[PDB]
Design an enzyme around this catalytic site. Structure first.
Site, short mmCIF file in Angstrom:
data_model
loop_
_atom_site.label_atom_id
_atom_site.label_comp_id
_atom_site.label_asym_id
_atom_site.label_seq_id
_atom_site.Cartn_x
_atom_site.Cartn_y
_atom_site.Cartn_z
N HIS A 249 -0.93 4.62 -0.81
CA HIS A 249 -1.92 5.67 -0.51
C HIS A 249 -1.52 7.13 -0.65
O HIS A 249 -1.56 7.90 0.32
CB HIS A 249 -2.50 5.48 0.90
CG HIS A 249 -3.41 4.30 1.01
ND1 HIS A 249 -4.44 4.07 0.13
CD2 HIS A 249 -3.43 3.27 1.90
CE1 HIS A 249 -5.06 2.95 0.46
NE2 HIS A 249 -4.47 2.45 1.53
N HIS B 75 -2.80 -5.13 2.78
CA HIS B 75 -4.06 -4.41 2.66
C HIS B 75 -4.54 -4.01 4.03
O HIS B 75 -5.61 -3.43 4.19
CB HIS B 75 -5.07 -5.33 1.93
CG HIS B 75 -6.50 -4.89 2.00
ND1 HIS B 75 -6.91 -3.61 1.69
CD2 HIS B 75 -7.62 -5.58 2.34
CE1 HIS B 75 -8.23 -3.53 1.83
NE2 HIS B 75 -8.68 -4.71 2.22
N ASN C 46 -8.33 -2.42 -3.24
CA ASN C 46 -9.69 -2.11 -2.81
C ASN C 46 -10.03 -0.66 -3.14
O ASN C 46 -11.20 -0.32 -3.30
CB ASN C 46 -9.92 -2.41 -1.29
CG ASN C 46 -8.82 -1.85 -0.37
OD1 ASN C 46 -7.63 -2.08 -0.65
ND2 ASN C 46 -9.20 -1.16 0.72
N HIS C 47 -9.01 0.18 -3.30
CA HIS C 47 -9.24 1.58 -3.61
C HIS C 47 -9.22 1.95 -5.10
O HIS C 47 -9.57 3.07 -5.44
CB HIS C 47 -8.23 2.45 -2.88
CG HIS C 47 -8.51 2.62 -1.42
ND1 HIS C 47 -9.06 3.77 -0.90
CD2 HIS C 47 -8.25 1.82 -0.36
CE1 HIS C 47 -9.12 3.68 0.42
NE2 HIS C 47 -8.63 2.50 0.77
N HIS D 56 -3.82 -7.76 -3.68
CA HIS D 56 -4.03 -6.74 -2.66
C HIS D 56 -4.65 -7.35 -1.41
O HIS D 56 -4.07 -7.30 -0.33
CB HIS D 56 -4.93 -5.59 -3.17
CG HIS D 56 -5.23 -4.53 -2.14
ND1 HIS D 56 -4.28 -3.65 -1.66
CD2 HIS D 56 -6.38 -4.22 -1.48
CE1 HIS D 56 -4.82 -2.86 -0.75
NE2 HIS D 56 -6.09 -3.18 -0.62
N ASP E 222 -5.91 7.72 -2.46
CA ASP E 222 -6.61 7.88 -1.18
C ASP E 222 -5.79 8.06 0.08
O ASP E 222 -4.65 7.60 0.18
CB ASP E 222 -7.60 6.73 -0.97
CG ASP E 222 -8.93 6.97 -1.66
OD1 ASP E 222 -9.58 7.99 -1.37
OD2 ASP E 222 -9.34 6.15 -2.50
N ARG E 223 -6.40 8.74 1.04
CA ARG E 223 -5.79 9.06 2.33
C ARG E 223 -4.75 10.15 2.19
O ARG E 223 -4.91 11.25 2.71
CB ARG E 223 -5.14 7.83 2.94
CG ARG E 223 -6.09 6.69 3.21
CD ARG E 223 -7.09 7.04 4.29
NE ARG E 223 -8.04 5.94 4.47
CZ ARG E 223 -9.16 6.03 5.18
NH1 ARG E 223 -9.49 7.17 5.79
NH2 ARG E 223 -9.96 4.98 5.25
N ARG F 275 -15.16 -5.81 7.77
CA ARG F 275 -14.91 -4.72 6.82
C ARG F 275 -16.23 -4.33 6.17
O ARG F 275 -16.75 -3.23 6.38
CB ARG F 275 -13.92 -5.16 5.72
CG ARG F 275 -12.44 -5.09 6.09
CD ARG F 275 -11.55 -5.31 4.87
NE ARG F 275 -10.12 -5.14 5.14
CZ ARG F 275 -9.59 -4.05 5.69
NH1 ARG F 275 -10.35 -3.03 6.04
NH2 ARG F 275 -8.27 -3.97 5.86
N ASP G 201 0.83 -1.19 0.00
CA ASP G 201 0.00 0.00 0.00
C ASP G 201 0.88 1.26 0.00
O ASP G 201 1.86 1.34 0.74
CB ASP G 201 -0.94 -0.03 1.21
CG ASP G 201 -2.18 -0.92 0.99
OD1 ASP G 201 -2.05 -1.98 0.32
OD2 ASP G 201 -3.28 -0.56 1.50
N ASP H 225 -3.87 -0.03 -3.96
CA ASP H 225 -3.97 1.08 -2.99
C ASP H 225 -2.97 2.21 -3.28
O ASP H 225 -2.18 2.59 -2.41
CB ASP H 225 -3.80 0.56 -1.54
CG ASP H 225 -5.12 0.04 -0.90
OD1 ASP H 225 -6.02 -0.37 -1.67
OD2 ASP H 225 -5.22 0.03 0.37
MN LIG Z 1 -6.39 -1.72 0.90
MN LIG Z 2 -5.07 0.37 2.32
#
Ligand SMILES: [Mn+2]
Ligand SMILES: [Mn+2]
Lengths: 388, 582, 293, 7
Positions: free
Chosen positions: C58, C240, C116-117, C166, C87-88, C213, C56, C84
């Protein structure tokens, strides 16, 4: 003995200048942790109803365990960080303060304890110093201040001018100078109750409090924190005089986020909270540009926005209004509801919209149809000529 | 061939599609150009004047534009024409806009003739200062500095009144403003007035209910002190400056900490020894981590600036005690700060004292837990040996340095790998070849590339220090027996160094001991290693002699131009076209 | 005809390295080029050793930079990220814009996998969307990127022995072929194999459990062990879930997690690490602290 | 712990 107007005025001075810095973990001799929980179960648990002796050793005591310049922030800069994610930093020696507040609270909160037993022992300079305090220990420290300042504002008709004005000054700085401050939220609640009780024919300093202080508080970006406490103030303000509806709504419209979906949702949410109370005679002044925007919200590509926008359609009242004014509204909403929804990824809205449309038929069949006509007709030309 | 576009921007200034209205306004200059001065003055300004804009991005732009119309409005004779709209942008709520609105008035103010100033520009400052709303008043402050010097004796007195008023405003906000500007406003008032007028305000804003005001007072203290002649310093400035060094609100103190060396100079070389020295300790032992570390940063420069004849004396009996305490503080940022300047003291206390006192501390930090404090100290050793004996260094410091060369935090291993070539040179090659070479060779194979890279280049700097001959006997060997490591990451390290050693290994050593392995590798399994071989031949290319080039190079640099992996391919080709081999 | 493009990517990259975004006009182009190249890849991309597996990222651009200061720099050193990207963080754009740029260029030097992102619905909720606005004005660079995301291959097999993804294992998935059949060319579904491959987690509760989740499941030691024995997998690598220590072993050295976003979301306070796979698939883990900003 | 969807 039976002469107490000298057992406390010496017992308080003990818990007063105490000063036990709990930032070394040494000298574990409480002593005072009791002296206070004493002056507590002494003025609380009906051990008294006659402790009005002219003596402000309480105040002084308080304004010594409390009044200190707050420490430097333990939280980061602020651009790449969101305060809703700030790790709370608890003030140590809380179990110590925790009472100094408690006592001072269960102090001038009790009956028979006159206001002039403080009138000039609790002056602006005390207020002000108390205000800064609104700054850091997870609500705990704030929470108390929130209450303390509340009750002080509701008993000294003399400090009302000040408390109010000095609260503004904190906000104008929050807004225009440092876009940083922790107790904005707590403070708004105080101003909550305050508003909810103004003069029936609203003094004109409040209408400025609202227009030039409150609304502009939506401009900030950390808004996610004091939004709800805010909205309340806006709403509550509109219940005490629905005249201001138009300017308040025109403001929320001017500001309206453009690069912050999350805020866009809040505005929508607060905006409904207002329509919810809007007055028909007023709804009309807004209506056009308001729905002219909702229009875009539906047509938004951010599922969270659109979703919250279309929900307006399940508000008995908001629908009620749209009807009595369908004439004008319906066509502003069409091109976007009836929009060619056949170009999306969120396999939901397409359906969420259909539903609104239906809810729009049952209201004025004719109009609904006539608008369709008008729309299609137009759309037609823009398809023929616009292909050369 | 036309004037249509420009004529359209003039129609998009009210287009109601903010995104366009912007552009138009954002080019507002080329509109007043093709417009034509005499016009701009009677149609474009009275339009920007009688038009309230909303969206800020636009308001911002208009304001920034208006400051350059000095010319397009007709020059100095009519610069007083830009006032009206700017005076309004000065009022706007959102600060930035009104901040720029101010940045402009100042800029175009210099273009007003004193006659105009007294008649059009001052009035704007007066009106802004007397504004119902604080913002205006806020702004106003930033405008005194620029017109005072040129107005008349009569007006200078009027301005001074209006400015004191801004200092005594009911709003913290306006006060904090007057506060920051108080410094620059004094710098223009005539001397006498600094004493009788500036001074009072100075002290008041200095003892404000609001600490956020008071601290700005300390900033302007440094400015006022440079205006006043010594004598008067202990009468008008000092009461207040000490006052702030003590001030309850650590924030005010913190300032006296940051603006210390600044106050030092301004005050004097003497009043310093009289008040600030004691005062300075107080800060070093402050209750607030900040104010402490704050002062720490100032240690080096505070001393190098102490009176020429007492420096060593006070740094020793006055400052050096507290230093020893800070070295052992609890808050990293304070240890970390002082440890990055502490060494500049060596050349003041001399060879001796440095070893008897400061040197021990260097060790304290050299081994502290906080990567910062280590890192921050490691960086100024290029020095010390210019005070302590080069032997004293290699005896009571080199050991640590030898240990630092491989502590956890890689940015620190680096810090050493960098100070190496100096230590090498000063210590001597024989000392190096004996108990130090094994290190520079270890780095060549660190887990973190950052460290290998630093190590690689490091060699080139050593070869420059000990001659080519030395490399061919202590370096080129190991740098080759590496090409046999299974991991390509290390395997490549070889071709890397080569690309560096050739730069400084004469045409010989390069052709007989490196070029052999830069070729033998062109037949490696991992493509990375192959396309790098190609990229290497391009680097050691020129250093080779024309005959070797079209002999042992092209032919083997061909067997790659026709290789599987797309990369090796491209890197072989761009290895020819540059060497000019096709 | 070849040095008319390959000489420009080299720059877009140089640019993205100074941390300056490409232009809207550029993003679209970069993405297209990227598409054609990703279409050809399978759902189980098989890339050979040696390599450097990263997790990840991000949008923590600078901390991505640090990573390279550790594992070496592309193309000189091969890589493989497991989703990933956005994001963030505060510099998503720059980050993803970059990693993609590197693919389009050194096509065989780096392998990017979906996370997932890399789906609209999330990017919208958690930030990549907004940042796109806050930086480009419209909302087109977002669509351009959310679109390139669908062509990103689901998983990767390192030398037929190590499996990368991931998220985790999925009930609806037993064999690697089961995955080669799926159609990843679509937005991440709320339920389904594909989804799970990107949401599943390793659990100690044993036997498919329900993921707290919201999507995917909580496979266990048992489930892991089997999957491996099935397709002939020596180790299943993913990442992840913030692993305070940079990377964690679980399920009796069968599956390992690798987070590469240090101090995550600039709040979490975790070291981050990456895993290197030499010429003979040897496990060597390099941990690193957030770059000094 | 920032909100499940993942500190
Ligand atoms: Mn993730
Ligand atoms: Mn993540």
């Amino acid at each position: 003995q039976e002469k107490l107007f000298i057992q406390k005025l010496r017992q308080c001075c003990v818990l007063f200048d105490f000063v036990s810095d709990p930032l070394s973990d040494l000298k574990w001799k409480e002593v005072k942790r009791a002296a206070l929980s004493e002056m507590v179960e002494y003025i609380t648990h009906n051990r008294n109803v006659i402790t009005e002796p002219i003596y402000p050793e309480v105040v002084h005591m308080f304004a010594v365990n409390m009044f200190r310049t707050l420490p430097p922030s333990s939280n980061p800069t602020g651009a790449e960080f969101d305060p809703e994610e700030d790790e709370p930093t608890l003030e140590a020696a809380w179990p110590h303060l925790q009472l100094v507040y408690e006592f001072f609270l269960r102090f001038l909160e009790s009956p028979d304890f006159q206001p002039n037993i403080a009138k000039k022992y609790i002056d602006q300079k005390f207020v002000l110093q108390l205000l800064e305090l609104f700054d850091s220990e997870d609500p705990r420290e704030r929470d108390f201040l929130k209450t303390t300042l509340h009750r002080i504002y509701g008993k000294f008709l003399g400090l009302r001018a000040y408390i109010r004005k000095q609260i503004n000054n904190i906000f104008y700085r929050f807004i225009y100078e440092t876009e940083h401050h922790n107790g904005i939220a707590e403070l708004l609640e105080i101003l909550g109750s305050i508003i909810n009780g103004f003069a029936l024919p609203l003094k004109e300093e409040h209408k400025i409090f609202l227009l030039k202080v409150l609304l502009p508080l939506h401009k900030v970006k950390s808004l996610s924190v004091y939004h709800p406490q805010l909205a309340y103030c806006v709403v509550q303000f509109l219940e005490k005089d629905s005249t201001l509806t138009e300017p308040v709504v025109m403001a929320l419209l001017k500001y309206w986020p453009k690069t912050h979906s999350p805020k866009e949702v809040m505005f929508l949410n607060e905006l409904e909270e207002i329509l919810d109370v809007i007055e028909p005679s007023e709804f009309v002044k807004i209506m056009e540009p308001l729905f002219r925007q909702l229009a875009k919200c539906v047509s938004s590509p951010h599922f969270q926005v659109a979703e919250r926008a279309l929900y307006y359609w399940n508000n008995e009242y908001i629908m009620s209004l749209i009807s009595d004014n369908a004439a004008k509204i319906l066509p502003i909403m069409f091109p976007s509801l009836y929009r060619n929804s056949k170009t999306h990824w969120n396999k939901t809205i397409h359906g969420l919209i259909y539903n609104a449309l239906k809810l729009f038929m049952e209201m004025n069949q004719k109009l609904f149809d006539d608008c369709t006509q008008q729309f299609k007709a137009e759309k037609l030309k823009e398809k023929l000529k616009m292909k050369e | 061939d036309s004037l249509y576009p420009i004529a359209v921007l003039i129609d998009e200034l009210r287009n109601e599609d903010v995104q366009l209205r912007l552009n138009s306004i954002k080019k507002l200059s080329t509109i007043a150009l093709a417009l034509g001065v005499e016009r701009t003055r009677s149609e474009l300004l009275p339009f920007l004047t009688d038009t309230i804009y909303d969206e800020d991005e636009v308001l911002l732009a208009l304001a920034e534009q208006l400051g350059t119309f000095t010319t397009l409005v007709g020059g100095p004779e009519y610069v007083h024409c830009l006032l009206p709209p700017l005076e309004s942008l000065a009022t706007v709520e959102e600060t930035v806009v009104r901040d720029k609105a101010v940045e402009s008035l100042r800029a175009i103010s210099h273009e007003h003739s004193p006659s105009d100033l007294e008649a059009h520009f001052v009035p704007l400052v007066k009106r802004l200062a007397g504004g119902d709303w604080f913002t205006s008043r806020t702004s106003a402050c930033g405008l005194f500095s620029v017109c005072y010097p040129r107005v008349s004796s009569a007006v200078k007195a009027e301005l001074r009144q209006y400015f004191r008023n801004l200092c005594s405003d009911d709003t913290p906000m306006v006060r904090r403003a007057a506060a920051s500007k108080l410094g620059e406003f004094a710098k223009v008032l005539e001397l006498d007035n600094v004493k009788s007028e500036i001074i009072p305000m100075f002290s008041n804003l200095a003892s404000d209910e609001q600490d956020s005001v008071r601290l700005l007072a300390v900033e302007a203290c440094v400015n006022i002190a440079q205006l006043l002649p010594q004598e008067d310093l202990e009468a008008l400035v000092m009461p207040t400056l000490r006052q702030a060094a003590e001030d309850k609100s650590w924030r005010v103190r913190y300032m006296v900490a940051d603006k210390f060396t600044e106050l030092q100079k301004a005050v004097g070389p003497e009043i310093t020894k009289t008040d600030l020295v004691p005062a300075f300790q107080n800060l070093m032992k402050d209750c607030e981590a900040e104010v402490r570390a704050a002062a720490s940063h100032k240690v080096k420069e505070f001393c190098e600036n102490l009176s020429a004849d007492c420096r060593e004396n006070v740094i020793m009996s006055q400052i050096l005690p507290c230093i020893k305490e800070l070295v052992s503080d609890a808050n990293q940022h304070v240890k970390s700060a002082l440890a990055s300047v502490i060494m500049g003291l060596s050349p003041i206390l001399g060879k001796d004292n440095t070893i008897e006192h400061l040197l021990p501390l260097f060790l304290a930090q050299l081994k502290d837990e906080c990567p910062e404090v280590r890192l921050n100290i490691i960086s100024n050793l290029d020095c010390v040996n210019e005070v302590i004996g080069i032997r004293q260094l290699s005896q009571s410091l080199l050991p640590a340095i030898v240990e630092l060369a491989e502590d956890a935090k890689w940015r620190v291993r680096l810090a050493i790998i960098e100070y190496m070539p100096l230590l090498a040179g000063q210590l001597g090659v024989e000392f190096f070849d004996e108990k130090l070479n094994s290190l520079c060779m270890a780095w060549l194979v660190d887990h973190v590339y950052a460290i290998r890279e630093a190590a690689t280049s490091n060699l080139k700097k050593l070869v420059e220090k000990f001659g080519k001959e030395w490399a061919h006997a202590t370096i080129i060997p190991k740098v080759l027996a590496m090409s046999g490591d299974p991991n390509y990451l290390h395997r490549m390290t070889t071709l890397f160094c080569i690309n560096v050693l050739s730069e400084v290994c004469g045409q010989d050593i390069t052709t007989k001991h490196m070029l052999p392995t830069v070729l033998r590798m062109a037949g490696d399994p991992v493509a990375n290693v192959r396309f790098n071989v190609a990229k290497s031949l391009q680097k050691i290319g020129p250093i080779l002699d024309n005959s070797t080039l079209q002999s042992e190079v092209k032919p083997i640099l061909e067997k790659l131009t026709q290789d599987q992996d797309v990369d090796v391919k491209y890197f072989a080709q761009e290895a020819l076209t540059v060497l000019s081999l096709a | 005809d070849e040095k008319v493009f390959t000489k420009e990517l080299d720059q877009w990259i140089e640019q993205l390295n100074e941390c300056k975004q490409l232009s809207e006009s550029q993003v679209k182009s970069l993405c297209e080029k990227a598409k054609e190249i990703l279409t050809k890849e399978s759902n189980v991309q098989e890339v050979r050793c040696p390599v450097t597996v990263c997790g990840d990222v991000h949008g923590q651009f600078h901390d991505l930079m640090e990573l390279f200061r550790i594992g070496g720099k592309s193309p000189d050193t091969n890589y493989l990220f497991m989703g990933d990207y956005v994001d963030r963080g505060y510099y998503s754009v720059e980050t993803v814009t970059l990693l993609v740029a590197l693919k389009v260029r050194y096509r065989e030097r780096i392998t990017i996998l979906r996370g997932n992102h890399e789906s609209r619905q999330i990017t919208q909720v958690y930030g990549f969307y907004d940042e796109c606005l806050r930086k480009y004005g419209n909302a087109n660079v977002w669509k351009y990127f959310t679109d390139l995301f669908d062509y990103l291959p689901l998983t990767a097999l390192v030398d037929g022995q190590i499996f990368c993804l991931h998220g985790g294992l999925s009930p609806s998935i037993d064999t690697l072929d089961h995955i080669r059949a799926l159609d990843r060319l679509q937005e991440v579904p709320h339920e389904g194999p594909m989804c799970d491959l990107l949401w599943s987690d390793p659990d100690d509760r044993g036997g498919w459990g329900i993921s707290p989740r919201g999507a995917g499941y909580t496979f266990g030691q048992d489930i892991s062990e089997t999957f491996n024995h099935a397709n002939g997998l020596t180790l299943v690598s993913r990442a992840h879930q913030l692993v305070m220590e940079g990377y964690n072993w679980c399920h009796d050295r069968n599956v390992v997690t690798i987070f590469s976003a240090p101090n995550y979301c600039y709040r979490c306070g975790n070291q981050a690490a990456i895993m290197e796979l030499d010429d003979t698939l040897k496990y060597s883990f390099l941990q690193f602290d957030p770059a000094p900003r | 712990x920032l909100x499940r969807x993942x500190x």
